[PDB]
Ligand binder design. Structure first.
Ligand SMILES: CC(=O)N[C@@H]1[C@@H](O)[C@H](O[C@@H]2O[C@H](CO[C@H]3O[C@H](CO[C@@H]4O[C@H](CO)[C@@H](O)[C@H](O)[C@@H]4O[C@H]4O[C@H](CO)[C@@H](O)[C@H](O)[C@@H]4O)[C@@H](O)[C@H](O[C@H]4O[C@H](CO)[C@@H](O)[C@H](O)[C@@H]4O)[C@@H]3O)[C@@H](O)[C@H](O[C@H]3O[C@H](CO)[C@@H](O)[C@H](O)[C@@H]3O[C@H]3O[C@H](CO)[C@@H](O)[C@H](O)[C@@H]3O)[C@@H]2O)[C@@H](CO)O[C@H]1O
Ligand SMILES: CC(=O)N[C@@H]1[C@@H](O)[C@H](O[C@@H]2O[C@H](CO[C@H]3O[C@H](CO[C@@H]4O[C@H](CO)[C@@H](O)[C@H](O)[C@@H]4O[C@H]4O[C@H](CO)[C@@H](O)[C@H](O)[C@@H]4O)[C@@H](O)[C@H](O[C@H]4O[C@H](CO)[C@@H](O)[C@H](O)[C@@H]4O)[C@@H]3O)[C@@H](O)[C@H](O[C@H]3O[C@H](CO)[C@@H](O)[C@H](O)[C@@H]3O[C@H]3O[C@H](CO)[C@@H](O)[C@H](O)[C@@H]3O)[C@@H]2O)[C@@H](CO)O[C@H]1O
Ligand SMILES: CC(=O)O[C@@]12CO[C@@H]1C[C@H](O[C@@H]1OC[C@@H](O)[C@H](O)[C@H]1O)[C@@]1(C)C(=O)[C@H](O)C3=C(C)[C@@H](OC(=O)[C@H](O)[C@@H](NC(=O)c4ccccc4)c4ccccc4)C[C@@](O)([C@@H](OC(=O)c4ccccc4)[C@H]21)C3(C)C
Ligand SMILES: CC(=O)O[C@@]12CO[C@@H]1C[C@H](O[C@@H]1OC[C@@H](O)[C@H](O)[C@H]1O)[C@@]1(C)C(=O)[C@H](O)C3=C(C)[C@@H](OC(=O)[C@H](O)[C@@H](NC(=O)c4ccccc4)c4ccccc4)C[C@@](O)([C@@H](OC(=O)c4ccccc4)[C@H]21)C3(C)C
Ligand SMILES: CC(=O)N[C@@H]1[C@@H](O)[C@H](O)[C@@H](CO)O[C@H]1O
Ligand SMILES: CC(=O)N[C@@H]1[C@@H](O)[C@H](O)[C@@H](CO)O[C@H]1O
Ligand SMILES: *[C@@H]1O[C@H](CO)[C@@H](O)[C@H](O)[C@H]1NC(C)=O
Ligand SMILES: *[C@@H]1O[C@H](CO)[C@@H](O)[C@H](O)[C@H]1NC(C)=O
Ligand SMILES: *[C@@H]1O[C@H](CO)[C@@H](O)[C@H](O)[C@H]1NC(C)=O
Ligand SMILES: *[C@@H]1O[C@H](CO)[C@@H](O)[C@H](O)[C@H]1NC(C)=O
Ligand SMILES: *[C@@H]1O[C@H](CO)[C@@H](O)[C@H](O)[C@H]1NC(C)=O
Ligand SMILES: *[C@@H]1O[C@H](CO)[C@@H](O)[C@H](O)[C@H]1NC(C)=O
Ligand SMILES: *[C@@H]1O[C@H](CO)[C@@H](O)[C@H](O)[C@H]1NC(C)=O
Ligand SMILES: *[C@@H]1O[C@H](CO)[C@@H](O)[C@H](O)[C@H]1NC(C)=O
Lengths: 756, 756
């Protein structure tokens, strides 16, 4: 029994809380029920107004790359893409730019960011791309900064999806169309997760989200230990609202709520989407919640807390005294909502170049045999539909980027499909950026952008073009979307065919991959004719113009992989996606904390490219490890505080105090200016413990040839602790702590031991 | 009986002739036969060397937009496209730029320009686009300047195709593969042409070519009065080499020569391609011509004249003392010629911008209801595959731009198909130019570039996109090629469908047409939803960036139609293309001189847009006609002279003396700077005579609002004459000459009468 704990406003929201409570205390039962459930409107979800007290409808709006379904905005790169920069500044600026467009379109609550659900159990996850690293620490850091960027713009965050939401297949959102109900077919997948794993792996990034001041959290579609996340008392009432001390609200995923009373008692604050979407995704608390309070079944006290948690965000971001503008676009779509759209342009100068910079900083060089950077080649060939436009238009796939035909030539993969996608004012195609440069060089350039397998002449055109080209670019992609997991690592479209042809007719093939996750290139990776391989992830609207400068040496590539690139899907955590028709599907997380590189490291498995890998046009030599135990500091800068119990607690100190700081020195040992992502790993001693765990990163920007720079890694008490299942608290174990530093999770030239 | 007249070198080539004759006089019979017939080589045709006297192989090379089948060059706009500028300066510069690329690739003889074959009898002609105006006077002027531009670059011209070559269908070039010979199937079409028509219509532009110093002329595939052009004594020996006093050589079209002895006796100088193309197109004079001289059948004298005519060009352009570089590309193609290609880059700074300027000057505004120039629209839609790249690459259609599949999306129509096409280093697509501008405006832009009739989702994508666009661009094309005539005026690809959809979903549709000739837009032209219509012809490699500035008002459109745009194919000269299986096909030119606008004017037929029509963004008011009879001048500036007999000949004067000059004044009466093409027409009195005939044009560049400029029209004796069939000479008739001036062939606000 995990009772609903009362909100008190915590640290930064004290005055907002007090206002929220004053306002909530005035409300009738109808009004409590109005604000805690969704109504029909232009946004993804809309809270009911409390019209007597001048509380307007709040506009809740997808999604984690910025406002979805909206014109007059910019298409930012996806979370995956910022992760790959390993650049905290970029992580924040991105979220801050997303925030002004959210705010300036009229959004009260952004359904963003993705802060560790899905985190990365399976590399086939259809929506893994919406997140950031397959790693609790790095996801933590990027989640914190993404939240800060959105809240600093005046927009309230719904960080998602809590929790253990690690596969799309059989997620089974509630839907009751006709009598054809989901409860009659299959329950959602049940993530069965042990207590140590839940704390050390899945909760980690959500602790960071909380600490950054996420105003809300979204409970996920999956069950946990066979109880829906949105009505799991242990999950919401104890882990989130007691141990993490979460003062904000729990919003249901759309169809995440499966009942009225348990949801009300077990931690849910907001029923979405309520009356939207024809009430087809369940509507368990409108009029129904009024009757439940009035007849004695759910206490008014309990619903008052829900309403206070909703209204805290509103007052803390000054949305009362500085209201967002009206929201003007029908993002639901006819015939579900028949309403006209207005028009607003929210693209500010500076945004296009920030989107660019994220691209240039993210693009990750995996193989370079000598063909890059390019100098001034005269004859360029380009292969792949990914090099050009969607032939039906950049937004032809619709409001959620998922409605084009299975075989359509969608063009450059600038984002993925689903609630996490967004419209584009244009797309700067790789081919167009490459042409621009080729003109500057008085060169020629030609591209085969048809489906090579089904267009008459395409193979003959490729055979004729490639042999006289000084360089051949092949552009490959792999679309995935929310709602399904990728069946395998296979390339999308005619990727396999394009690669076969290109190696047959050219011995200087440069391969660029725009993708939602890892793909299968085993057939080509080791061919000498493939001279370079880059992965550019999901770069948003500035696809071409962020990549070409890297290709041409204007700026050296500095991105590194945010997950592990294994040679086979068999090399990962088993049963990453469970396929069953069983009424009550089960997914046992028997691996525990061992996901991504932790699996590979513990199991002695060699990846093709490891977590934290990415090449430069230069080399960096790591020297002079320092662990400085006198460089400690009190945690003063968290927006909100958790109540995570820890052994070393003395009433005055924090789990997030920095206990020591570690330094290293990098030197540019090669022939060109370059940026380097230094990483730090710690092997924390214990039973059945990861070979090593990321606990720092620091990116040196534009280090000249011969120059050196210090890299600095503040280490927090938490960074060195384990969860005691027996004592239910964090503690620093006894033993030798190996501290490693270098350029990847497997290129760790500096090691030392720390023993407390 | 029309004897072969001996070359004497004429006016400018006197010293070259003397050298040519000295060299020819040394040759053996083998060597005479070597240089007058084609050999295997990298070029379209190659004359045999005279190796003992250090006379190298000459490289004869297509085509009239510049060197075909070659990399490292530029794709110039087609002749049609320069005609539409009505800009003499552009006409010359184009040809001069074509010349340096020809010369710098190693070409001795350019198979260019097209100087009145085809001229424009039928608007369905598959290769009409290679020419310039459907008008003897204007074609004359552009032919003269095109020749001058090429010869001034050091390249010898083969002006083509002499003569009455007015349809591709049943042109029936000689070809003897196996025993499957063309003589066994069908003779070439027989242009049956009367003497007055041949002189006043078809010979006119070739007189100009001669006068500009065309070094060679190509005899055509067709028969005339049932005798092959290439062996028509009256045509070659008398009309060309006696009356026009042509001092240069007659090169056969490739398969234009049908026999050995008549060709030798009746005016042919050079048998092409001889041993090239497997000797499959006839090889009537190699070893065969040696035996004919040696056995007494053809006089050595006669073949000496052929060789002197070939070598005159060589010496006059200093190709002996300043040889072209070696020619490096296999332009024939395997398996016909199995030879590797080298590489040379010949693109000079300044050429891309000249190609652009020709585009900007040519694009012709046909309808403007108020939607242009654009200001700064925020939402742009674009329709049509013509807006983007060929999906297989810009040169995927091969060496003659004619080998892509019937349904391939070839992209922007930057040139036509056949021997007159050329490769492209890139193509600047309309969409890419429009995107560039749209970015500058912080606008959005989306394009449906699939085949709207056969791609799943394309019609739904168009329906969704168009209604919220501030403006919809539809890009339409119509490919034709040498070897076939267009069956009708129908749009290519899915043009009809695109236009239907666009008017259904948008009321501000702007239509841009890239075409080889007139098309059928009757279904849409009068729809209020079509707010503007432009025809951009064949703009070459700078398609997009020449059009967008005109669209946006950066420069006002100043092009005008070089032919008549009739509402129906039935409105033109009858039997424009004759289709028959008759062994000896006949085409009687019963219309006489009445082709294009002369037909329409005489027959009282209203075109949709007349010859010489094109709108501005301003208006020009024409005032103050002056005919100044004291402004006469002696013809001093012709490179070579004709021997056209004329009644007013006194031993001292010329048919090309300017006898008076006529002036008018234009004033910019509208609201914007603009350029205007003033035209002058003369109605020459007589029996069965054209309502009026173009005899001048003058383009005022960038006339500011309120300002005025004088327009000046020098009139030549020839410009006012008729051919006397009875007396076989030119004469100025008696009667009233109406002299009209204005902005089109039907907008002639200034008239006066001249009576000698
Ligand atoms: C699998 C998992 O993660 N389960 C967790 C629960 O562990 C967790 O609840 C905590 O459990 C703590 C005890 O730890 C041991 O608990 C389990 C023991 O039961 C076993 O069940 C299995 C059968 O399925 C058996 O294999 C096992 O032998 C044992 O069962 C049986 O043993 C007897 C035979 O000898 C038999 O007679 C009985 O039938 C008996 O049931 C065990 O599952 C667990 O193992 C996991 O962890 C270890 C170590 O990492 C790992 O190696 C294993 O593989 C497993 O993964 C472990 O060995 C218990 O101490 C906790 O209780 C504290 O906390 C709560 C809430 O805060 C308090 O109410 C309670 O009073 C107590 O707190 C007080 O005491 C401590 C100091 O003692 C103070 O610090 C504290 O502040 C406070 O004052 C707790 O109940 C729950 C939490 O909800 O999540 C599950 O997922
Ligand atoms: C159709 C066409 O264009 N044909 C031209 C030929 O015209 C041209 O050759 C020139 O012809 C000049 C004569 O003009 C008249 O000629 C034709 C007369 O023959 C007719 O044939 C048809 C039948 O098919 C009949 O309809 C017609 O009645 C006549 O035939 C018969 O008439 C008699 C009945 O009364 C009968 O007894 C006979 O059977 C006779 O054959 C005629 O076709 C032509 O008509 C065209 O032009 C007019 C006017 O534009 C037009 O209205 C018509 O519709 C037609 O289109 C026209 O009426 C002739 O003067 C020329 O001869 C000069 O030139 C050559 C070469 O330079 C010299 O060798 C010759 O000596 C002479 O030159 C000398 O004389 C003049 C002054 O007289 C001097 O200036 C000059 O310097 C020199 O000293 C010439 O033969 C040929 C050229 O190759 O092309 C054809 O296509
Ligand atoms: C069914 C469904 O998913 O509905 C939507 C509407 O809201 C949900 C959520 C989803 O997005 C998000 O999840 C992350 C949260 O942070 C967001 O707040 C949330 O929006 C939605 C909005 C969305 O954008 C998503 O991209 C979409 C999906 C996934 C489409 O859903 C499906 O394709 C369903 O599989 C399919 N279900 C069945 O066929 C079915 C199974 C069993 C029994 C009965 C039926 C389905 C269901 C309804 C309609 C089509 C397909 C659907 C979305 O269109 C969108 O849903 C609707 O538009 C809609 C749903 C129900 C009634 C009326 C309209 C989802 C689509 C945008 C493509
Ligand atoms: C048949 C033919 O046209 O041959 C070519 C080779 O030279 C001729 C001329 C043509 O271009 C030009 O005309 C203007 C002049 O100024 C130029 O100097 C001249 O080159 C050619 C070079 C060319 O570029 C043209 O674009 C091409 C055409 C038109 C192709 O010709 C055909 O499609 C023929 O209709 C077809 N004929 C028959 O099928 C046939 C009819 C009756 C009896 C027997 C056969 C044909 C013939 C041969 C091969 C394919 C098709 C062919 C060109 O490829 C090119 O010709 C050859 O490559 C070639 C011809 C013969 C033997 C070996 C090679 C013409 C093509 C470039 C596409
Ligand atoms: C469905 C409906 O009645 N909507 C009204 C809306 O028109 C009004 O502006 C608002 C004031 O809070 O209250 C809503 O309830
Ligand atoms: C087919 C052949 O023999 N070609 C030769 C060529 O190698 C040589 O350079 C040239 C000198 O004029 O003479 C040609 O006849
Ligand atoms: C309370 O109301 C709910 C919702 O109307 C209903 O399901 C339930 O049976 C009611 N209970 C009582 C005790 O009236
Ligand atoms: C939207 O309109 C269509 C008919 O135009 C109708 O079928 C549909 O039910 C409407 N939707 C709603 C929610 O009223
Ligand atoms: C590499 O490319 C060349 C063509 O340039 C081809 O001949 C060769 O077979 C290719 N090598 C491999 C390993 O595919
Ligand atoms: C998951 O683990 C539980 C706990 O032992 C087990 O009882 C259950 O049957 C397992 N389900 C699987 C492997 O699907
Ligand atoms: C002259 O030679 C040609 C070509 O070889 C031949 O056709 C003809 O019959 C010969 N004539 C004589 C009279 O020998
Ligand atoms: C070119 O080579 C092919 C085989 O590679 C051969 O069939 C053809 O006849 C060759 N052409 C010539 C003109 O020798
Ligand atoms: C013009 O466009 C509108 C849509 O904007 C359409 O309703 C109307 O039918 C069209 N008019 C014509 C003449 O096609
Ligand atoms: C062309 O005109 C001639 C001269 O009158 C005539 O004899 C011939 O039969 C005509 N051919 C046609 C109309 O095809």
């Amino acid at each position: 029994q995990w009772p609903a704990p009362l909100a008190n406003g915590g640290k930064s929201w004290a005055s907002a809380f007090k206002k929220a409570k004053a306002t909530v205390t005035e409300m009738t039962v109808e009004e409590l029920a109005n604000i805690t459930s969704g109504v029909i409107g232009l946004c993804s979800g809309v809270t009911g107004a409390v019209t007597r007290l001048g509380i307007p409808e709040f506009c809740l709006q997808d999604g984690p790359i910025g406002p979805r379904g909206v014109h007059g905005s910019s298409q930012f790169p996806a979370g995956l893409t910022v992760a790959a920069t390993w650049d905290r500044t970029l992580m924040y600026a991105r979220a801050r730019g997303m925030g002004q467009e959210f705010h300036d379109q009229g959004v009260h609550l952004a359904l963003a960011p993705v802060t560790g659900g899905p985190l990365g159990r399976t590399p086939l996850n259809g929506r893994g791309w919406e997140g950031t690293f397959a790693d609790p620490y790095a996801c933590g850091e990027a989640s914190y900064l993404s939240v800060k960027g959105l809240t600093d713009a005046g927009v309230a965050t719904v960080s998602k999806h809590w929790i253990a939401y690690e596969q799309e297949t059989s997620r089974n959102l509630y839907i009751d169309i006709d009598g054809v109900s989901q409860a009659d077919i299959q329950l959602p997948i049940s993530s069965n997760v042990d207590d140590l794993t839940m704390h050390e792996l899945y909760m980690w990034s959500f602790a960071e989200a909380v600490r950054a001041g996420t105003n809300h959290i979204m409970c996920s579609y999956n069950r946990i230990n066979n109880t829906h996340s949105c009505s799991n008392a242990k999950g919401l009432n104890q882990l989130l609202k007691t141990e993490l001390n979460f003062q904000g609200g729990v919003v249901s995923d759309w169809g995440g709520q499966w009942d009225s009373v348990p949801a009300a008692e077990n931690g849910l604050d907001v029923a979405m989407p309520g009356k939207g979407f024809l009430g087809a995704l369940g509507d368990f608390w409108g009029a129904t919640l009024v009757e439940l309070i009035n007849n004695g079944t759910v206490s008014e006290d309990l619903v008052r807390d829900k309403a206070v948690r909703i209204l805290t965000g509103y007052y803390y971001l000054g949305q009362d005294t500085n209201p967002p503008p009206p929201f003007v676009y029908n993002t639901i779509g006819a015939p579900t909502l028949n309403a006209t759209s207005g028009y607003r342009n929210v693209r500010k100068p500076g945004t296009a170049e920030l989107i660019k910079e994220i691209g240039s900083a993210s693009v990750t060089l995996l193989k370079n045999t000598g063909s890059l950077p390019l100098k001034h080649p005269q004859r360029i060939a380009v292969l792949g539909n990914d090099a050009t436009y969607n032939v039906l238009g950049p937004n032809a796939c619709g409001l959620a980027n998922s409605a084009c035909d299975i075989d359509n030539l969608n063009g450059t993969l600038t984002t993925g499909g689903g609630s996490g996608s967004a419209l584009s004012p244009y797309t700067i195609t790789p081919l167009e950026a490459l042409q621009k440069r080729a003109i500057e060089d008085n060169a020629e350039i030609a591209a085969v952008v048809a489906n090579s397998n089904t267009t008459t002449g395409a193979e003959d055109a490729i055979a004729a073009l490639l042999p006289d080209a000084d360089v051949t670019f092949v552009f490959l992609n792999r679309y995935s979307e929310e709602g399904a997991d990728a069946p395998d690592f296979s390339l999308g479209g005619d990727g396999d065919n394009l690669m076969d042809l290109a190696v047959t007719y050219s011995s200087n093939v440069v391969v660029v991959i725009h993708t939602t996750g890892v793909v299968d290139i085993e057939k080509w990776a080791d061919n000498p004719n493939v001279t370079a391989i880059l992965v550019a992830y999901l770069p948003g609207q500035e696809a071409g113009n962020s990549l070409v400068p890297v290709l041409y040496g204007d700026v050296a590539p500095s991105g590194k992989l945010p997950w592990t690139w294994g040679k086979s899907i068999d090399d990962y955590v088993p049963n990453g996606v469970v396929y069953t028709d069983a009424y009550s599907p089960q997914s046992n997380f028997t691996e525990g904390v061992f996901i991504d590189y932790r699996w590979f490291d513990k199991m002695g498995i060699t990846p093709r490219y490891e977590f934290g890998f990415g090449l430069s046009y230069t080399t960096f030599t790591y020297s002079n490890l320092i662990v400085d135990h006198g460089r400690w500091a009190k945690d003063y800068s968290s927006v909100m505080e958790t109540a995570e119990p820890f052994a070393e607690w003395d009433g005055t100190n924090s789990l997030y105090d920095v206990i020591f700081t570690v330094f290293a020195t990098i030197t540019n040992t090669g022939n060109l200016t370059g940026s380097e992502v230094a990483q730090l790993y710690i092997s924390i001693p214990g039973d059945n413990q990861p070979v090593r765990q990321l606990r720092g990163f620091d990116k040196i920007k534009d280090l000249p040839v011969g120059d050196s720079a210090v890299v600095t890694f503040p280490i927090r008490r938490k960074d060195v602790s384990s969860w005691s299942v027996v004592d239910q608290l964090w503690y620093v174990p006894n033993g030798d702590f190996l501290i490693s530093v270098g350029g990847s999770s497997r290129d760790l030239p500096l090691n030392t031991t720390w023993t407390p």
